[PDB]
Design a protein around this nucleic acid. Structure first.
Lengths: 102, 46, 93, 63, 77
RNA sequence: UAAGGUGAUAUGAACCGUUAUAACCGGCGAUUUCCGAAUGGGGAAACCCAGUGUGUUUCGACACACUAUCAUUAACUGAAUCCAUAGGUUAAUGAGGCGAACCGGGGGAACUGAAACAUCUAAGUACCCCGAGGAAAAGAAAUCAACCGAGAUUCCCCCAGUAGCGGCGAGCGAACGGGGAGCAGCCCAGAGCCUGAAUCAGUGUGUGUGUUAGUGGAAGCGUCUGGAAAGGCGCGCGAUACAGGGUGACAGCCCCGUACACAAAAAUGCACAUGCUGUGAGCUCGAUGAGUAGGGCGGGACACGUGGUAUCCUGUCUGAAUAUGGGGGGACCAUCCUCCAAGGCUAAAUACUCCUGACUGACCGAUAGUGAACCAGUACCGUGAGGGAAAGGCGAAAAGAAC
RNA sequence: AGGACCGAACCGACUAAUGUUGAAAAAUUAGCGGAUGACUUGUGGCUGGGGGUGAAAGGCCAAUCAAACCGGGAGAUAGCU
RNA sequence: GCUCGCCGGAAGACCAAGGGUUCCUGUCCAACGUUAAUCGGGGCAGGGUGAGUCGACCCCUAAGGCGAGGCCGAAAGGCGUAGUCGAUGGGAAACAGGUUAAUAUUCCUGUACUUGGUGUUACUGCGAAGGGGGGACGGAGAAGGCUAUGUUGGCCGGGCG
RNA sequence: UACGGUGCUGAAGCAACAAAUGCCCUGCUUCCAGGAAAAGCCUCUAAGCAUCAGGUAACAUCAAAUCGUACCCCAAACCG
C-alpha cells in the first residue's frame, strides 16, 4: 500500500521551507504529491478561451516528492514513519515509534 | 530520351508481386529473408 | 424479412453538413456517412427502418483519406463511404 | 469476486441487447456527430454493456 | 527417378580419375530396365523398373515375396 | 490488490471509484474482421466468384455450417473383360506452413597455399536440398589387445605434431595405451510350463515440491554552508537488512526495496498402494538374419594419394560356408588368440540459444556500443534481389517567459 | 502493281555549328535518309549469365557487358604502392 | 481592366498508362518557388469523386502461365493430360439539355432501352463440358451514295459608325 | 447589384452548294504472302419427365449488386 494517502496531514522534509505542514490534495502516479500551500509557483498564464481568459501570474501548487513528504503525528508534533501491520487482508497504517493506528 | 523505368502496375505485380514470390520456393526464401530482416513492406510492388 | 437489426448499424453519422449536402437536402437528398462495407440495399433498409421516411434510390461513393501531416510523421486518414439517400417527398419536420 | 454482472443472468438477453444496440448506440452516434456534450462516457458505457450481454449470450443457451 | 524399386539403388556419385589423377565429378547410374513380371497368385503382370541385380533378387526370392516387401515399404506398383 | 484511475506523444473534455465489487496484476474462459500453409474455385496478398445443406422470410432476400490436396484405412459402386483389377464416390485419422543456432543425410565449389601449376591443398569448408529432436547421431564387439588382458556408445586431457601419408613438396596426421565425466542393458527372427505375474505408455483428485498474482519487512535528529543536504560538525539507533535505485549535492535509519519470514480461487513442471487400460514376466528346449560374406572392374572413406596395402561402402558382373561354420588380428600363409556380420530399440555424460528470469563485467558510452540509446531495418536508393542512414542531454521542478 | 518516285505525321540519325561544371550522364538548331513495308507502334507474354539474343558490332541483356546485378566464400590473394 | 505579342494537326480539347488529392474554398508566407511575392502544384484547415446503360468485375478465349492424376528427374524440381487462369481481342442496354466553387452519358428534367427473377393468362415437346450454323477476320485499289463539317443566300434581331 | 452575378421574357431557327482520311464498307474489285480462338446468339436431338417440370407470347411487379469516377495526362501531377 501507499504510505501517504489522498487526504493526509503531512509535513515536508526537504526543499524551500521544510518546516511547513499541510494536507495532500492529489497523489500522482509519478511518485509525487500535491500538498496544500507548499510549492507555490507563479505561472505566467497566457490568455485562452473557456477558463482563465485574461491570464495572470496567479500562484499554483507544484508537485513535490512523496519521499520529501513525511506524515504528521498530532500527539507528538514531529515527522513520522508509516507501517502496515494488521491481521486481515485490509492492512491499517500505524505510526512508528508510537504504534498507534492512523 | 526513353529511360529504363517505364511503369506498369500489372507487370509490376506479375513480376515482383506477392503471389509471384509465393509461387516459387526461391521467392518464398526472398519473403523469409525480408521477414527476418524485418521489412515494413515485404513486396514493395504490392 | 428485412435485414437484421444488428446489421442495421451501417448508418454512422447523420449529416456531413456543408453546402453540397445542405443544398441536396434543400432540393432532394439526405447525405450520410454509412459504414465502409454497407451495400445500397442495407442503406435503403436502414434509412427506412431507423427513420420514418421512405427512400427511392441510394447513391454511394467511397471517399479516400488524405495525408494532412508533414514528413516527420506521415499518416493517412481512413476511407469512408458517403451515401446520397433520396427521400425528397412527404416530410414536414 | 471483483465485478458484479450477475444481475442480467435472466432471460430476454436478446431483447436487452436489442435495446442496447437498436437506437441507443445509434442515437448516441447521431448525437455525437451532430454535437452534444455528455456522450463521451455514454458511448463507451453502451458499447461495454453490449459486450456484457453478448458474452452472457455466448455463455448461456436459455436466453 | 532412377531408383531400383526393389533394392533401392539410386545414382551414386564418384570421380572420373585419369592417368594424371585429375578428379572430375561423375555419377554411377543403376542398370535399370522396365520389366513385366508374371505373378501367379494374382494371375497377371506387374511392371517394375528394376536393376539387373534386382531381377536376380526377384529370381532368387520369388516375385510374391518381393511385392510383399514393396507393400510393406508402401511403394506402388 | 487498491485510493485512486479511463496506455503514450497529450493537455483538455465527459466520467468511473472508496478500500465489502473503479483502475492495476495473475489463473481460467468468451470474442478473435480480411489476407497469409490459406484449405470451396480463381487471383495482380489483404480481392473477385460460387455450390450443397439447415433455419428465417415482411418474397426484397438474410444468417450459419460444410465443400482444397496428399497419405493410410473402411464402406458402397465400377471398365476394356466374363471373374477380378484399374478407376469413381463417401467417411475417419494424420500431414502441409513458419522458426536463430545445434544434429543426421543427399549433393558440393572456387579464390587460396604449393612462392607458377595439373597430383595435392583449401575442404567435404562455403552454399543448395531433405528430415528430426530437445538434443540429434552413435551404441551393446563378426571391437581391440597380445599369449597378459580389457569388456556398449559419446565427450574432455594426454599419447603426439608421434607412427605414418605426402609432386615423401606444400602440407595432412592417427591408433594402441593411460587418466577422467557419465555409465542399465535388452528384444524379434519360436514352441511348450504361464493368463495383469514384475517393466513400459496413457489416465482426474493425494502427499512432497517449484511456476503463473503477491504480503509483512528494522533503525535520524539538532546545527553550518547552500536555491535545495543525502555533505561538514555533534549526538544516537538498526543490521541474518551497509545489493541496488530514486529523492533539489554524496542517505544503512526519506521512499522503493534488500536479509529474513511467509502466501494461491484456479491452471500447471517431477518420485507411489498410484483405480484401471493394453503390451508383457521367469524356466526348459530349439534356432542363430543369402543375392549376404568374399571376388573381378570403376570409384569413394579410412591420418593412409593403390603403394608391398589390410579394413569399410557399393555403381557393375558374379558369388559361399552357414557353428565339425565364419570374421578379424594392416599384403599373404600356417599356428594361436579373440569375436559372431548380413534384424532392431536404448537414458546419461556432448552440442546450441530465436527466446524467459536473475546476477555479473580492469566491456562501450552517442563518429563508441547492435545498422538502430531517438516511432530503425525507418527515411531515402534500386525494376527487383537488395542496400541503408543521420538524429541523445533546458531545468530540481515548466516555475516553458503574464504584461 | 511495285521491299516504285517526291514529300508531312511516324521511324531514323549523314554533315555542320552550339553546348562539354550542358536546358540534356548524347540533346538543340539548320539541313539530311526511309516513309505500303525485310515498315512503324500500343498492350501482354516467352528466352537468364560460359547463359540468352544478335540482317554480326563482341552489339544488346535496366545510364553496368570479351561475360549483368545482388548476397555469400571473403578480411580471396597482392614478392606491389 | 485596356492595349501588344505567341501557339493554334497545338503551346487547344478528351482519355489510356502512370501518378495519387496536385482538384475547390478559407487562411498564412518560415522553409519550398533559382528574384520579391499579397501568388502557388507550398504550409494548415474544411469540402469535393453520386451509374442497371461509362470502365472494371462478369461470360469467352490468343500468346502464354499454373496444372489433379501422369511421365521424368540425387533432392529441389522439369514437362504436361483433364482442367483452370490469362486482354492487347469477342457477347445486353442512354441520349439531349440544365446544374456545383469543385461531380456529370452518374445528380435534376424530358424522352428511352436492355438482361434476369417471380406471379397470372393463352398455346405447346421440353431437355447437353454433344452435333451444325454463326461469330469469324489479309493486303492493296477504285468507285458511287452520303454525313460530320464549312461557305453563300433567305429570315430574324441590332446598327446607321 | 454587395458590380461573384440572380431571375423573367426570349425573335428567326430555312434553303442551296462544296465536303472528308469518317459512314455504307467486315461491302466490291483484284492479288498472293492465302489472312485468331472460344463464348454470348440460332437450331437439332441423347439420357430423362408427361393436365409434371420446361419453352414461347402478353401483362403486372421486383432486381441490375460491388469497385473506379476529383485532378494532371505533346506534362511544373507520368519516365528523366
Amino acid at each position: 500500500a501507499a504510505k501517504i494517502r489522498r487526504d493526509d496531514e503531512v509535513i515536508v522534509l526537504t526543499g524551500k521551507d521544510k518546516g511547513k505542514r499541510g494536507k495532500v490534495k492529489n497523489v500522482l502516479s509519478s511518485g509525487k504529491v500535491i500538498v496544500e500551500g507548499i510549492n507555490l509557483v507563479k505561472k505566467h498564464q497566457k490568455p485562452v478561451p473557456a477558463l482563465n481568459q485574461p491570464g495572470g501570474i496567479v500562484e499554483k501548487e507544484a508537485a513535490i516528492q512523496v519521499s520529501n513528504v513525511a506524515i504528521f503525528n498530532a500527539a507528538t508534533g514531529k515527522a513520522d514513519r508509516v507501517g502496515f501491520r494488521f491481521e486481515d487482508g485490509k492492512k491499517v497504517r500505524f505510526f512508528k515509534s508510537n504504534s498507534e493506528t492512523i | 530520351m526513353k529511360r529504363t523505368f517505364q511503369p506498369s502496375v500489372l507487370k509490376r505485380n506479375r513480376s515482383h508481386g506477392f503471389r509471384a514470390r509465393m509461387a516459387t520456393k526461391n521467392g518464398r526464401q526472398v519473403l523469409a529473408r525480408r521477414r527476418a530482416k524485418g521489412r515494413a513492406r515485404l513486396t514493395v510492388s504490392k | 424479412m428485412i435485414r437484421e437489426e444488428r446489421l442495421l448499424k451501417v448508418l454512422r453519422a447523420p449529416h456531413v453538413s456543408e453546402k453540397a449536402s445542405t443544398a441536396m437536402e434543400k432540393s432532394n437528398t439526405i447525405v450520410l456517412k454509412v459504414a465502409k462495407d454497407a451495400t445500397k440495399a442495407e442503406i435503403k433498409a436502414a434509412v427506412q427502418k431507423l427513420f420514418e421516411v421512405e427512400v427511392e434510390v441510394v447513391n454511394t461513393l467511397v471517399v479516400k483519406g488524405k495525408v494532412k501531416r508533414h514528413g516527420q510523421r506521415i499518416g493517412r486518414r481512413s476511407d469512408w463511404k458517403k451515401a446520397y439517400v433520396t427521400l425528397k417527398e412527404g416530410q414536414n419536420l | 469476486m471483483k465485478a458484479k454482472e450477475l444481475r442480467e443472468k435472466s432471460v430476454e438477453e436478446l431483447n436487452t441487447e436489442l435495446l442496447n444496440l437498436l437506437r441507443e448506440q445509434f442515437n448516441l452516434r447521431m448525437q455525437a456527430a451532430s454535437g452534444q456534450l455528455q456522450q463521451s462516457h455514454l458511448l463507451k458505457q453502451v458499447r461495454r454493456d453490449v459486450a456484457r450481454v453478448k458474452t452472457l449470450l455466448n455463455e448461456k443457451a436459455g436466453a | 527417378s532412377r531408383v531400383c524399386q526393389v533394392t533401392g539403388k539410386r545414382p551414386v556419385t564418384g570421380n572420373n580419375r585419369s592417368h594424371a589423377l585429375n578428379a572430375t565429378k561423375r555419377r554411377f547410374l543403376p542398370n535399370l530396365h522396365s520389366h513385366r513380371f508374371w505373378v501367379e497368385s494374382e494371375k497377371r503382370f506387374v511392371t517394375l523398373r528394376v536393376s539387373a541385380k534386382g531381377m536376380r533378387v526377384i529370381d532368387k526370392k520369388g516375385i510374391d515375396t518381393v511385392l510383399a516387401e514393396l507393400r510393406a515399404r508402401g511403394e506402388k506398383y
